[PDB]
Design an enzyme around this catalytic site. Structure first.
Site, short mmCIF file in Angstrom:
data_model
loop_
_atom_site.label_atom_id
_atom_site.label_comp_id
_atom_site.label_asym_id
_atom_site.label_seq_id
_atom_site.Cartn_x
_atom_site.Cartn_y
_atom_site.Cartn_z
N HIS D 4 -0.28 33.58 -24.84
CA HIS D 4 1.01 33.88 -25.63
C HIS D 4 2.14 32.85 -25.16
O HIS D 4 3.28 33.44 -25.48
CB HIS D 4 1.35 35.17 -25.21
CG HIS D 4 0.20 36.32 -25.54
ND1 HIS D 4 -0.91 36.51 -24.83
CD2 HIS D 4 -0.26 36.90 -26.83
CE1 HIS D 4 -1.88 37.52 -25.37
NE2 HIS D 4 -1.34 37.50 -26.72
N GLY D 20 14.39 42.02 -24.24
CA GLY D 20 13.56 42.50 -25.06
C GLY D 20 13.64 41.58 -26.42
O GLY D 20 12.56 41.32 -26.92
N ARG D 24 18.07 37.44 -28.15
CA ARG D 24 18.80 37.55 -27.09
C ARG D 24 18.73 36.65 -25.73
O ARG D 24 19.56 36.42 -25.14
CB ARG D 24 19.03 39.04 -26.64
CG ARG D 24 20.04 39.58 -25.60
CD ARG D 24 21.40 39.11 -26.40
NE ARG D 24 21.50 40.06 -27.66
CZ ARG D 24 23.16 40.16 -27.92
NH1 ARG D 24 23.92 39.42 -27.64
NH2 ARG D 24 23.20 41.03 -29.16
N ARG D 43 4.75 32.85 -31.32
CA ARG D 43 5.16 34.40 -31.84
C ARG D 43 6.46 34.79 -31.83
O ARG D 43 6.89 35.62 -32.37
CB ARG D 43 4.40 35.53 -30.97
CG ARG D 43 2.93 35.47 -31.13
CD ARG D 43 2.10 36.50 -29.98
NE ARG D 43 0.73 36.36 -30.33
CZ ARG D 43 0.10 37.15 -31.29
NH1 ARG D 43 0.71 38.30 -31.90
NH2 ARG D 43 -1.17 37.05 -31.44
N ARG D 87 14.23 42.21 -15.82
CA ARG D 87 14.43 42.60 -17.09
C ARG D 87 16.18 42.99 -17.28
O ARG D 87 16.59 43.45 -16.36
CB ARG D 87 13.73 43.86 -17.37
CG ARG D 87 14.10 44.65 -18.48
CD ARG D 87 13.16 45.65 -19.02
NE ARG D 87 13.73 46.74 -19.88
CZ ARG D 87 14.40 46.54 -20.93
NH1 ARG D 87 14.39 45.33 -21.78
NH2 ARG D 87 15.10 47.60 -21.62
N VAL D 88 16.55 42.29 -18.37
CA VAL D 88 17.83 42.86 -18.71
C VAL D 88 17.83 43.17 -20.16
O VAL D 88 17.69 42.62 -21.10
CB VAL D 88 19.07 41.49 -18.77
CG1 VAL D 88 19.06 41.26 -17.12
CG2 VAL D 88 18.30 40.31 -19.36
N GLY D 89 18.16 44.55 -20.31
CA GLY D 89 18.06 45.54 -21.40
C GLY D 89 19.29 46.48 -21.69
O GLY D 89 20.05 46.50 -20.92
N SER D 90 18.92 47.34 -22.62
CA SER D 90 19.54 48.35 -23.02
C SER D 90 19.00 49.74 -22.78
O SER D 90 17.78 49.40 -22.82
CB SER D 90 20.05 48.19 -24.57
OG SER D 90 18.99 48.44 -25.21
N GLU D 179 14.37 53.57 -21.48
CA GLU D 179 14.16 52.54 -22.02
C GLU D 179 12.54 52.45 -22.38
O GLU D 179 11.93 53.39 -22.54
CB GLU D 179 14.59 50.96 -21.49
CG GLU D 179 14.54 51.23 -19.85
CD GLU D 179 13.06 50.78 -19.55
OE1 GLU D 179 12.24 51.55 -18.89
OE2 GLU D 179 12.68 49.44 -19.52
N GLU D 181 10.27 49.46 -20.93
CA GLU D 181 9.35 48.40 -20.46
C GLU D 181 9.41 48.41 -18.81
O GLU D 181 8.23 47.99 -18.29
CB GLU D 181 10.04 47.03 -20.85
CG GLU D 181 10.16 46.83 -21.82
CD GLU D 181 11.02 47.33 -23.26
OE1 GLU D 181 12.16 47.91 -22.58
OE2 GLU D 181 10.89 47.24 -24.23
N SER D 203 23.53 52.10 -23.87
CA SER D 203 23.94 51.71 -25.40
C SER D 203 24.09 52.85 -26.18
O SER D 203 24.65 52.78 -27.18
CB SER D 203 22.93 50.70 -25.99
OG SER D 203 23.05 49.11 -25.31
N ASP D 204 23.72 54.06 -25.56
CA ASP D 204 23.63 55.14 -26.56
C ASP D 204 23.72 56.42 -25.64
O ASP D 204 23.00 56.26 -24.28
CB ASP D 204 22.31 55.00 -27.29
CG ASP D 204 22.24 56.16 -28.16
OD1 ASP D 204 23.21 56.49 -29.07
OD2 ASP D 204 21.09 56.85 -28.63
N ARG D 217 31.54 46.40 -25.71
CA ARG D 217 30.22 46.41 -25.17
C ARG D 217 29.40 45.17 -24.90
O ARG D 217 28.51 44.89 -24.13
CB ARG D 217 29.33 47.14 -26.60
CG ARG D 217 29.87 48.43 -26.89
CD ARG D 217 28.94 49.20 -27.99
NE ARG D 217 28.81 48.27 -29.27
CZ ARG D 217 29.51 48.46 -30.45
NH1 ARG D 217 30.58 49.42 -30.30
NH2 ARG D 217 29.43 47.54 -31.36
#
EC number: 2.4.2.1
Lengths: 237, 237, 237, 237, 237, 237
Positions: D4, D20, D24, D43, D87-90, D179, D181, D203-204, D217
């Site tokens: 992959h 993710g 980004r 991919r 990992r850097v996410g929301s 989240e 992951e 984010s929510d 944000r």
């Protein structure tokens, strides 16, 4: 009073050190605390409250296993205003590089108990310590010239497990120490909105074995208690 | 010696009475046994051995919860030649017709612990007492003019369960008493080829509540011990 | 009538003996009961009612497996006023000392079925017989000069198991006989507030080939039936 | 190359930041890294390598969900010499006091995935971050004047859950963000002997509609990235 | 002969139709088959072999529940050369638009049994029919001008379920009929290397509890049988 | 628009083909569709709508794993009027007689994911395709002279499974291809009320590890797409 603690609000400090062996509570009180007073004797689980460098501290054994320590930690939190619990105990090691008398700090605790699945709708609850408490203990250890390892404990329901292969799995996934309480204490902490930490010293290597002396053991136990106590003072800032 | 019992083969009788509260061991020894001698003090879990009507009997507390009693019962069986264990304790009732101070005998023990699933390939192990021990206790109770109820206990991992609805389920399925050890003791008995029985007196009704006196409690505790002791003599025939 | 039994209240006695094979229920009625009449034939699941020493008794097949016998026992209990079910069957043995033709009484039944987990909130329900019924059977066997072992059955969902390894586990934990129904019947009894007992004769061993004669096996089968019937008479008193 | 990732050893830094969204990752490289080159596009899962204050750093998308990110993190660790994953996410929040734009650091991650039960013999593996990485992130945030909460994430398999009731449970047990992951990445890190950390911005909220501005944000998102990058520099020392 | 079937290789056709009720197997043999001979009566589980339009066909009851039909289907497959099993059963409907006497074809079967988890390492085995057989049944139904729905059955272990709420879940997920066998038969077909299909007629409605006439029952019972028999003929081509 | 798709009702056809790789969706649009327009690029998850032989058709990547494809399929169904989802993916074979480039049609899908247990009260939900869609694909394959096997897929959460032995179990139970989505897509189709089918091409062999040419890959990739597209046309009639 509660079903297992004959005391009233105020009799305990907001921080409680908890060994498994109830005989260690009195030792800790006499060795490390000033002005200690007896605050519980139910079922011989002696509890004391005194001060360490002016700071109010309580010490009371939790008995062996998740169900036992879950009872005491719950009652302390809900009925005695306890904010922080530090279990101080021993663990068996599975990793070759983890040595007898090493200090291990359980930032997380794996388990084969069902108690957290019961809490968490049969999903995986990551049983974790309070991060600041972990860092306070690491920092307190370093100030005492002791390097502590931080990672996962495994909290076993069966000291005598019929599943010999599980130790290999523990080792594969980096488990630092095997004991019988941390995941349960962490679960109660989350359930009732408090904070907890388990610190252990390695008393056995489930691989090599190879023993130690009584004087070495006492020194190491004293080191662990000093770490726990000094860590509280750092937490107060 | 074993990790939790500082004794040698022969120090214990082949039958051991086990209360949860370690303070009860000394009480039982002083009240019911002749010529009692101290045989263990590790972690304050005092153990004694003496005779009841000439018959060698030992008594030692098991601590709270399945993991704790599993440790002691295993060590007794594998290292001290123990053949029979009788847990003597208290339980909470969920059935309306089950009354405070009733004597309950756990022919089976349900549980929310995972320990038997771990033993039994994740299937349902029916955690059961030894039948003759059950019948001996029933017969000994009747001879003392006490009628005992025989059926399922429920051995809880969490004294403070977040699942309030489980008590209704227990009641629906006829559970006689809730305690925290029987299923674990029964599992160890099966694992290591010995025999066990749990007898409890009802100390609480998780429904009605409605309390009792200290004198009533002592009388009832004494009744339970007399039942256990006389039941052993019937078992010897 | 119920969905699987074409009969009316009163057609059954308040005690029903149940073999798995409906042809065996006809055998029992013809051999042991006086004035026996057929009271069900739906799905070929023959049921009969007659008298044994003047006592009204029924016998009816339950089919193979927990789901089949759960249907019949439920319907008998809720719609035909049945108070006691005695399963009379065959079982396989895994323990060296348990022999062909031994009579085994299931005080408890282990299982790999999910039915009791479904009833009991995914926890361990100890599927147990009624204690008085067990004692009545033990006493009837003694009066007939027959040894009877009392312990755990294992009720299997798969007669042809993919998991050969489970037999070693049953043996390790002391299971006396393997059959396909007891844990299901005990679950129904608890759910619907009735009483049950499973008695089996050992028809097969995992190791093996001890063998006997047809006459001896059939003699032992009849002895099991006599034990069952006589146990009822003892309960009545 | 791996199944992959179309790249070769050396193409990635020994630390990889992972959002993710692959779009980004391009954003992060363009915004924060100097001399960044694309090192994967299989991919459409864009990965980049460049420098931050002279330190070699990579950033690459991980896709949505434990199974997707488990593929990428494994391959990086076993075939590209990667030692640390951040990992850097929301995340969504369930706790009243946790606000839009808060920065959350997952010292642990709960999950309803079976992947860790698969790894860990059907027991509870506490999916944890690396402690030193957590401390580095906490310290980097402090240096930037940013508050960061450290605790449990919940990694969900179903963004659209049928079980609305699970959010009340997460809230009860103190989960800081939801989240998809972290628990998967922590499981891979333990399995393959590497180190990981998940940082998210809220984010929510489950309740809700506090809202903020796009500029605010995006400012907070950038602060999370700065915390991540600066945490690496602290680890290096 | 096998343990539950007194017959020899050759006595059964390579295709066996199986209702749960042995008396229905008898009815099918008398009504649809020419030169029908009884080939088994062990346990009353009647089995017959005859011809339909010149094609050798057998029909035999399988009893109620997964454990029962698992015995019979296994033995037929391993010891009697049986290549296809067609269950021809009854089911209860949960969907409002599914009517009494509707014919349903189970391309798949959900279940609350543990049997396939035992086979499939506690993962989700999708218990499915043979596709060619499903298609043969669909086409035969069309040629007969008989409506038939294709989809999921649910194979219950408890005809009398204590979990009424699960029917809402079955309805939600589009379950066409609730019976007690398909998932077990499909698991046997896969384990032992044969092919299987379950066809049912809606005999009751789990919600409405509504009713049918004797005439209606077996003309629709007849429609199901015709479909099954004609489907074999298509499969032969 | 929905949280992962920036588009509006009408932008998608009522049928969507979905490979895991967005770049393949792009390839399909360019190769097979006329007047193709890009309708989404959020997270790089390319989606297109065009016509095939006059029929409006969309194609969009769904990413890797059950949690990823569950997001996209749900949103398409609830917010874009999508009636049928056809996954067009790759899979690994476990059966010796399944060859690279073979086309497999998943009438069912096994899984080690917990998602359907979460939906189905921890019972076994048989994750199945829509039967008409399966039949359309079989017939289209026949018209194109392309071989296709119909049966079970296995949808894995871990592409890199630590349980190598499970592949022996998949092989035992006749699993045709191991991929990472079907069971989740089927569970979404059932939950949200749409229809779905998974078709895969064997892209690798889990045992042999054997190889393919670039030319071979996408002419067989092409065969799969042709089957999917022609199957829609049959369904329309």
């Amino acid at each position: 009073a509660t079903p297992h603690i004959n005391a009233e609000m105020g009799d305990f400090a907001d921080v409680v050190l908890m060994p498994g062996d109830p005989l260690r509570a009195k030792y800790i009180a006499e060795t490390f605390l000033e002005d200690a007073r007896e605050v519980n004797n139910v079922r011989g689980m002696l509890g004391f409250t005194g001060t360490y460098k002016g700071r109010k501290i309580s010490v009371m054994g939790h008995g062996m296993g998740i169900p036992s320590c879950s009872i005491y930690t719950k009652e302390l939190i809900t009925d005695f205003g306890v904010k922080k619990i530090i279990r101080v105990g021993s663990c068996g090691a599975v990793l070759p590089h983890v040595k007898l008398r090493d200090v291990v700090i359980g930032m997380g605790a794996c388990t084969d108990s069902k108690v957290n699945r019961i809490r968490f709708k049969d999903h995986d609850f990551a049983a974790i310590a309070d991060f600041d408490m972990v860092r306070n203990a690491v920092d307190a250890a370093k100030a005492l010239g002791i390097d502590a390892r931080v990672g996962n404990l495994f909290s076993a329901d069966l000291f005598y497990s019929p599943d010999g292969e599980m130790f290999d799995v523990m080792e594969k996934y980096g488990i630092l120490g095997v004991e019988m309480e941390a995941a349960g204490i962490y679960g109660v902490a989350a359930e009732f909105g408090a904070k907890a930490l388990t610190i252990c010293t390695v008393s056995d290597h489930i691989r090599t074995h190879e023993q130690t002396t009584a004087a070495e053991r006492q020194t190491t136990f004293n080191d662990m208690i000093k770490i726990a106590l000094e860590s509280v003072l750092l937490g107060d800032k």
